[PDB]
Coordinates of all heavy atoms in Angstrom, one line a residue:
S1 N 0.8 -1.2 0.0 CA 0.0 0.0 0.0 C 0.9 1.3 0.0 O 0.6 2.2 -0.7 CB -0.9 0.0 1.2 OG -1.9 1.0 1.1
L2 N 1.9 1.2 0.8 CA 2.9 2.4 0.8 C 3.5 2.5 -0.6 O 3.6 3.7 -1.1 CB 3.9 2.2 1.8 CG 3.4 2.2 3.3 CD1 4.5 1.9 4.3 CD2 2.8 3.6 3.6
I3 N 3.9 1.5 -1.3 CA 4.5 1.5 -2.6 C 3.5 2.0 -3.6 O 3.8 2.8 -4.5 CB 5.1 0.2 -3.0 CG1 6.3 -0.1 -2.1 CG2 5.6 0.2 -4.5 CD1 7.2 1.0 -1.9
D4 N 2.2 1.6 -3.5 CA 1.2 2.1 -4.4 C 0.9 3.5 -4.2 O 0.8 4.3 -5.2 CB -0.1 1.3 -4.2 CG -0.8 1.0 -5.5 OD1 -0.3 1.3 -6.6 OD2 -2.0 0.5 -5.4
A5 N 0.8 4.0 -3.0 CA 0.7 5.4 -2.7 C 1.9 6.2 -3.2 O 1.7 7.4 -3.6 CB 0.4 5.7 -1.3
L6 N 3.1 5.6 -3.2 CA 4.2 6.3 -3.7 C 4.3 6.4 -5.2 O 4.7 7.4 -5.7 CB 5.5 5.6 -3.2 CG 6.8 6.2 -3.5 CD1 7.7 6.2 -2.2 CD2 7.5 5.6 -4.6
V7 N 3.8 5.4 -5.9 CA 3.9 5.4 -7.4 C 2.6 6.0 -8.0 O 2.6 6.3 -9.2 CB 4.0 4.0 -8.0 CG1 5.2 3.3 -7.3 CG2 2.8 3.2 -7.8
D8 N 1.6 6.3 -7.2 CA 0.4 6.9 -7.7 C 0.6 8.4 -8.0 O 0.0 8.9 -8.9 CB -0.8 6.7 -6.8 CG -2.1 6.9 -7.4 OD1 -2.2 7.2 -8.6 OD2 -3.2 6.8 -6.7
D9 N 1.4 9.0 -7.2 CA 1.7 10.4 -7.4 C 2.5 10.7 -8.6 O 2.5 11.8 -9.1 CB 2.4 11.1 -6.2 CG 3.6 10.3 -5.8 OD1 4.6 10.2 -6.6 OD2 3.6 9.8 -4.6
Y10 N 3.2 9.7 -9.1 CA 3.9 9.8 -10.4 C 3.0 10.1 -11.5 O 3.3 10.8 -12.5 CB 4.8 8.6 -10.7 CG 6.0 8.6 -9.8 CD1 6.0 8.3 -8.5 CD2 7.3 8.8 -10.4 CE1 7.1 8.2 -7.7 CE2 8.4 8.7 -9.6 CZ 8.3 8.4 -8.2 OH 9.4 8.4 -7.4
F11 N 1.8 9.5 -11.5 CA 0.7 9.8 -12.5 C 0.3 11.3 -12.4 O 0.2 11.9 -13.4 CB -0.5 8.9 -12.2 CG -0.3 7.5 -12.8 CD1 -0.3 6.4 -11.9 CD2 -0.2 7.3 -14.1 CE1 -0.1 5.1 -12.4 CE2 0.0 6.0 -14.6 CZ 0.0 4.9 -13.8
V12 N 0.2 11.8 -11.2 CA -0.1 13.2 -11.1 C 1.0 14.1 -11.6 O 0.7 15.1 -12.3 CB -0.4 13.6 -9.6 CG1 -1.1 15.0 -9.5 CG2 -1.3 12.5 -9.0
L13 N 2.2 13.8 -11.3 CA 3.4 14.5 -11.8 C 3.4 14.5 -13.4 O 3.7 15.5 -14.0 CB 4.6 14.0 -11.2 CG 5.9 14.9 -11.5 CD1 6.8 14.9 -10.2 CD2 6.7 14.3 -12.6
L14 N 3.2 13.3 -13.9 CA 3.2 13.2 -15.4 C 2.0 13.9 -16.0 O 2.1 14.5 -17.1 CB 3.2 11.7 -15.8 CG 4.5 11.1 -16.2 CD1 5.4 11.1 -15.0 CD2 4.3 9.7 -16.7
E15 N 0.9 14.0 -15.3 CA -0.2 14.8 -15.8 C 0.2 16.3 -15.8 O -0.1 17.0 -16.8 CB -1.4 14.6 -14.8 CG -2.8 14.6 -15.4 CD -3.9 14.2 -14.5 OE1 -4.0 14.8 -13.4 OE2 -4.5 13.1 -14.7
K16 N 0.8 16.8 -14.8 CA 1.3 18.2 -14.8 C 2.3 18.5 -15.9 O 2.2 19.5 -16.6 CB 1.9 18.5 -13.4 CG 0.8 18.9 -12.4 CD 1.3 18.5 -11.0 CE 2.3 19.6 -10.4 NZ 2.1 19.8 -9.0
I17 N 3.2 17.6 -16.1 CA 4.2 17.8 -17.1 C 3.6 17.7 -18.5 O 4.0 18.3 -19.5 CB 5.4 16.9 -17.0 CG1 5.1 15.5 -17.3 CG2 6.0 17.0 -15.6 CD1 6.3 14.5 -17.1
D18 N 2.5 16.9 -18.7 CA 1.8 16.8 -19.9 C 1.1 18.1 -20.2 O 1.0 18.6 -21.3 CB 0.8 15.6 -19.9 CG 0.1 15.4 -21.2 OD1 0.6 14.7 -22.1 OD2 -1.0 16.0 -21.4
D19 N 0.5 18.7 -19.2 CA -0.2 20.0 -19.4 C 0.9 21.0 -19.8 O 0.6 21.9 -20.6 CB -0.9 20.4 -18.1 CG -2.1 19.6 -17.8 OD1 -2.7 19.1 -18.8 OD2 -2.5 19.4 -16.6
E20 N 2.0 21.0 -19.1 CA 3.1 21.9 -19.5 C 3.5 21.7 -20.9 O 3.8 22.6 -21.7 CB 4.3 21.8 -18.5 CG 4.0 22.4 -17.1 CD 4.1 23.9 -17.1 OE1 3.9 24.6 -18.1 OE2 4.5 24.4 -16.0
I21 N 3.7 20.4 -21.4 CA 4.0 20.1 -22.7 C 3.0 20.7 -23.7 O 3.3 21.2 -24.7 CB 4.2 18.6 -22.9 CG1 5.6 18.1 -22.5 CG2 3.9 18.2 -24.3 CD1 5.8 16.7 -22.5
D22 N 1.7 20.5 -23.4 CA 0.7 21.1 -24.2 C 0.8 22.6 -24.4 O 0.6 23.2 -25.4 CB -0.7 20.7 -23.7 CG -1.7 20.4 -24.8 OD1 -1.3 20.2 -26.0 OD2 -2.9 20.4 -24.5
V23 N 1.0 23.3 -23.2 CA 1.2 24.7 -23.3 C 2.3 25.1 -24.1 O 2.2 26.0 -25.0 CB 1.3 25.3 -21.8 CG1 1.8 26.7 -21.9 CG2 0.0 25.1 -21.0
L24 N 3.5 24.5 -23.9 CA 4.7 24.8 -24.7 C 4.4 24.5 -26.2 O 4.9 25.3 -27.0 CB 5.8 23.9 -24.2 CG 7.2 24.1 -24.8 CD1 7.7 25.5 -24.6 CD2 8.2 23.0 -24.2
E25 N 3.7 23.4 -26.5 CA 3.4 23.1 -27.9 C 2.6 24.2 -28.6 O 2.9 24.7 -29.7 CB 2.8 21.7 -28.0 CG 2.1 21.4 -29.3 CD 1.6 20.0 -29.4 OE1 2.4 19.1 -29.1 OE2 0.4 19.8 -29.7
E26 N 1.5 24.5 -27.9 CA 0.6 25.6 -28.4 C 1.4 26.9 -28.6 O 1.2 27.5 -29.7 CB -0.6 25.8 -27.5 CG -1.8 26.3 -28.2 CD -1.9 27.7 -28.4 OE1 -1.6 28.5 -27.4 OE2 -2.3 28.2 -29.5
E27 N 2.2 27.3 -27.7 CA 2.9 28.5 -27.9 C 4.0 28.5 -28.9 O 4.2 29.5 -29.6 CB 3.4 29.0 -26.5 CG 4.5 28.2 -25.9 CD 5.9 28.6 -26.4 OE1 6.0 29.8 -26.9 OE2 6.8 27.9 -26.2
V28 N 4.7 27.4 -29.1 CA 5.7 27.4 -30.2 C 5.0 27.4 -31.5 O 5.5 28.0 -32.5 CB 6.7 26.2 -30.1 CG1 7.7 26.4 -29.0 CG2 5.9 24.8 -29.9
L29 N 3.8 26.7 -31.6 CA 3.1 26.8 -32.9 C 2.6 28.1 -33.2 O 2.6 28.6 -34.3 CB 2.0 25.7 -32.9 CG 2.4 24.3 -32.7 CD1 1.3 23.5 -32.2 CD2 2.9 23.7 -34.1
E30 N 2.0 28.8 -32.2 CA 1.4 30.1 -32.4 C 2.4 31.3 -32.5 O 2.4 32.1 -33.4 CB 0.3 30.4 -31.4 CG 0.8 30.6 -30.0 CD -0.4 31.0 -29.0 OE1 -1.6 31.0 -29.5 OE2 -0.1 31.2 -27.8
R31 N 3.3 31.3 -31.5 CA 4.2 32.5 -31.4 C 5.5 32.2 -30.7 O 5.5 31.9 -29.5 CB 3.5 33.7 -30.8 CG 3.1 33.5 -29.3 CD 2.6 34.8 -28.7 NE 3.3 36.0 -29.1 CZ 4.6 36.2 -28.9 NH1 5.4 35.3 -28.3 NH2 5.2 37.3 -29.4
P32 N 6.6 32.2 -31.4 CA 7.9 31.9 -30.8 C 8.4 33.1 -30.0 O 7.8 34.2 -30.0 CB 8.8 31.5 -31.9 CG 8.2 32.3 -33.1 CD 6.8 32.4 -32.8
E33 N 9.6 33.0 -29.4 CA 10.3 34.0 -28.7 C 11.7 33.6 -28.6 O 12.0 32.4 -28.6 CB 9.6 34.3 -27.4 CG 10.4 35.2 -26.4 CD 10.4 36.6 -26.7 OE1 9.3 37.2 -26.8 OE2 11.5 37.2 -27.0
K34 N 12.6 34.6 -28.4 CA 14.1 34.3 -28.3 C 14.3 33.3 -27.2 O 15.2 32.4 -27.3 CB 14.8 35.6 -28.1 CG 16.3 35.4 -27.7 CD 17.1 34.9 -28.9 CE 18.5 35.6 -29.0 NZ 19.2 35.3 -30.2
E35 N 13.7 33.5 -26.0 CA 13.9 32.6 -24.9 C 13.1 31.3 -24.9 O 13.3 30.5 -24.0 CB 13.7 33.4 -23.6 CG 12.3 34.1 -23.5 CD 11.2 33.2 -23.0 OE1 11.5 32.2 -22.3 OE2 10.0 33.5 -23.2
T36 N 12.1 31.2 -25.8 CA 11.2 30.1 -25.8 C 12.0 28.8 -25.8 O 11.7 27.9 -24.9 CB 10.3 30.1 -27.0 OG1 9.4 31.3 -27.0 CG2 9.5 28.9 -27.2
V37 N 12.9 28.6 -26.8 CA 13.6 27.3 -26.8 C 14.3 27.0 -25.5 O 14.4 25.9 -25.1 CB 14.6 27.4 -28.0 CG1 15.5 28.6 -27.9 CG2 15.5 26.1 -28.1
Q38 N 14.8 28.1 -24.8 CA 15.4 27.9 -23.6 C 14.6 27.1 -22.6 O 15.0 26.0 -22.1 CB 15.7 29.3 -22.9 CG 16.6 30.3 -23.7 CD 17.9 29.6 -24.2 OE1 17.9 28.7 -25.0 NE2 19.1 30.2 -23.8
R39 N 13.3 27.5 -22.4 CA 12.4 26.7 -21.6 C 12.4 25.3 -22.1 O 12.6 24.3 -21.3 CB 11.0 27.3 -21.6 CG 11.0 28.8 -21.6 CD 9.8 29.4 -22.2 NE 8.6 28.6 -21.9 CZ 7.9 28.7 -20.8 NH1 8.3 29.5 -19.8 NH2 6.8 27.9 -20.6
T40 N 12.1 25.1 -23.4 CA 12.1 23.7 -23.9 C 13.3 22.9 -23.5 O 13.1 21.8 -23.0 CB 11.9 23.7 -25.4 OG1 10.7 24.3 -25.8 CG2 12.0 22.3 -26.0

């Protein structure tokens, strides 16, 4: 149960990084910036 609770939050973290990936994708497609690639 402890291991399951430990590995379940990795799904939440991957959800957050997926949302960040979507934001980054939308913004590189619509409008770039000199520092944009830096974030990527």
Side-chain angles (χ1 to χ4, degrees):
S1 189
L2 294 174
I3 294 315
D4 216 9
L6 187 135
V7 307
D8 198 2
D9 54 61
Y10 286 71
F11 281 115
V12 192
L13 189 141
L14 263 65
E15 216 168 62
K16 277 151 79 142
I17 72 183
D18 184 85
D19 291 331
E20 289 279 30
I21 275 173
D22 215 18
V23 169
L24 183 63
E25 165 172 308
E26 210 274 316
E27 66 89 16
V28 286
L29 301 153
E30 66 177 1
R31 64 171 320 300
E33 165 78 61
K34 170 74 142 188
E35 53 86 20
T36 294
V37 54
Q38 296 313 59
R39 320 154 39 79
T40 294

